Every structure is written in structure tokens, then in C-alpha cells.
Amino acid sequence: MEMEKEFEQIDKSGSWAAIYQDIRHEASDFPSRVAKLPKNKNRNRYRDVSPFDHSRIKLHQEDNDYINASLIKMEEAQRSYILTQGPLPNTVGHFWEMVWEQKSRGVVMLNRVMEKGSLKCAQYWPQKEEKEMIFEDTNLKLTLISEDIKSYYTVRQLELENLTTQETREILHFHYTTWPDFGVPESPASFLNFLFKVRESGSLSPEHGPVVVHCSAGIGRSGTFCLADTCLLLMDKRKDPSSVDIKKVLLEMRKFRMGLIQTADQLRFSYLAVIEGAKFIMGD
Numbered sequence: 001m002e003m004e005k006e007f008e009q010i011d012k013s014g015s016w017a018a019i020y021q022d023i024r025h026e027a028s029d030f031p032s033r034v035a036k037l038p039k040n041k042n043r044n045r046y047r048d049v050s051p052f053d054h055s056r057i058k059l060h061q062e063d064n065d066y067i068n069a070s071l072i073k074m075e076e077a078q079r080s081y082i083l084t085q086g087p088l089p090n091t092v093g094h095f096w097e098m099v100w101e102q103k104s105r106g107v108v109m110l111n112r113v114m115e116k117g118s119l120k121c122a123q124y125w126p127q128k129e130e131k132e133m134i135f136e137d138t139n140l141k142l143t144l145i146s147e148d149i150k151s152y153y154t155v156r157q158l159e160l161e162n163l164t165t166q167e168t169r170e171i172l173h174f175h176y177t178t179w180p181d182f183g184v185p186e187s188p189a190s191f192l193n194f195l196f197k198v199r200e201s202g203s204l205s206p207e208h209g210p211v212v213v214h215c216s217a218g219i220g221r222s223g224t225f226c227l228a229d230t231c232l233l234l235m236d237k238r239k240d241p242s243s244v245d246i247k248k249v250l251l252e253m254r255k256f257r258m259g260l261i262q263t264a265d266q267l268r269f270s271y272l273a274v275i276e277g278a279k280f281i282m283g284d
């Protein structure tokens with residue numbers, strides 16, 4: 001069923017809450033035993049958000065291999081994403097270790113460091129060229145190279161150096177800065193513009209490791225980003241773009257990380273973004 005029509009039918013009926021709870025009821029339940037070990041309590045931002053054991057990212061060290069991050073692998077779309085929480089004071093070094101080990105080109109950030117008067121994430125990147133960061137726990141150095149500040153997002157060029165081997169790589173930081181403290185944006189225009197800038201960069205392409213995507217918990221805004229990308233890619237690839245079922249794509253992605261899309265408003269926003277993006281890409 002053409003999603004634009006399904007959309008107006010849910011809107012006129014006002015059944016967004018009922019659709020959203022049907023998804024919550026049908027979603028996969030897999031074990032998260034590593035996340036709940038007592039040695040990992042200070043590696044988790046929220047007690048109710050854990051990566052499944054089968055899909056979790058492992059750090060390459062014998063000590064403790066645990067990070068709150070999951071590999072979302074979309075077989076038909078031929079896209080992979082790592083979804084992770086906003087790093088904590090004790091996990092900044094683990095975060096950059098994962099970026100290095102997985103060969104990611106891009107980091108996508110969908111939150112501000114402070115929102116609603118509370119800290120949503122650590123200040124994990126350098127704000128001035130001449131004041132670099134050193135993560136001694138993981139033996140990495142991070143330097144700000146350049147910064148391009150626009151109305152809805154900022155793009156930063158970073159240099160990450162493995163101090164062990166003296167290898168360096170360029171990492172692009174895509175920071176969406178205007179998601180509101182409450183609710184979702186009114187128009188998906190600036191979010192779609194942002195997604196097309198990440199795509200243009202090569203960060204989402206198969207010649208690199210998976211893009212690292214985060215918000216505060218790594219399931220809400222982060223969920224919206226990968227559901228919209230994968231849905232628009234499937235509409236490009238298939239003979240009938242109207243066969244793409246956004247609820248079925250979301251349940252497939254929820255096999256790999258729990259809780260993706262946190263509210264009925266985020267579900268409605270995801271529909272709006274896909275419906276609108278399907279147009280501009282090929283003038284519909």
C-alpha cells in the first residue's frame with residue numbers, strides 16, 4: 001500500500017499511538033547478558049538500553065571488549081550502520097577505539113552536548129585546532145583540522161592518530177544541531193538535506209567501514225536516520241517503489257538493536273521524511 005495513502009489514513013483516523021504499540025508488541029527479544037555484567041555498569045548511559053549479544057560491537061582488547069554499540073546489517077539495501085549511545089566520561093577512549101578498529105570514515109551526531117539543562121553526551125572532540133585530545137587508555141590522538149558551521153548542521157574534519165603505529169586517518173564529523181528539545185522537527189526538509197550531505201561524503205559507502213551514528217541513547221533520532229536512509233535506497237533499487245513497507249523495515253532493523261524509534265511522533269516524522277525524500281531525488 002503506497003505509504004503516502006497509509007499516512008493520510010492514519011492521520012485522519014489519529015491512530016499513530018496504536019500503530020506504534022503494534023510495532024513494540026511484535027519487535028524481537030534477544031539476550032543482552034554482556035551489557036548486564038556488573039563490571040559494565042559504568043559503560044551504560046541508560047539501564048533499559050542495551051545491545052543484543054548477537055549484534056554487539058567488540059573492542060579488540062583482552063581486558064574488557066564491551067561497548068554500548070550494535071551493528072545494523074541491511075542485506076537487501078547493502079548498507080551497514082553502527083548505532084551507539086552518546087559517549088560517557090569513562091567511554092570517550094572506547095568510542096574512538098571502535099571508530100579506528102571498524103575503519104569508519106564518518107561520525108553522525110544528532111544531539112547537543114546539553115539539552116533540557118542536562119548533559120546528554122560528553123565533549124568527546126576538540127573545539128580548537130591548537131588544543132588536541134589524547135585518550136591514554138586507548139593510545140589515540142584527535143586533532144581538529146577544520147570546521148564549517150551552517151544554520152542546521154556543522155561539518156568538522158578531524159585527524160585520528162593511532163599513537164602505537166603512527167598511522168593517521170581523516171574522520172568527518174556530521175553534527176545535526178537543530179533537533180528541538182521536545183517533539184520532532186515540523187518539516188523534514190533540513191534533516192533530508194543533512195542525510196544527503198552525509199551520503200555525498202562517501203561515509204555511507206562500501207569502500208569504508210560502517211558509519212557510527214549516535215544521539216543520547218542511540219535508538220530514537222539515531223533510529224530515524226538509518227530507517228529513512230534504508231527506505232529511500234530500497235525505493236531506488238526495486239521495480240515498484242510502492243512495495244517498500246516502512247513498518248517491515250523498522251522490525252527488521254529491531255532484530256539488531258532494541259527500541260529503534262522511541263515515540264509515535266518519531267514514527268510519523270520517519271514516514272514524512274521518506275515520503276518527501278522520495279520526490280526530490282528523482283522529482284517523484
Ligand SMILES: Cc1ccc(CC(=O)NC[C@@H]2CCCO2)cc1
Pocket residue numbers: 088089092122123124131132133134135
Ligand atoms: C570526557 C572526556 C574525557 C577525556 C578527554 C581527553 C583529554 O582531553 N585529555 C587531556 C589531554 C590534554 C591535551 C591532550 O589530551 C576528553 C573528554
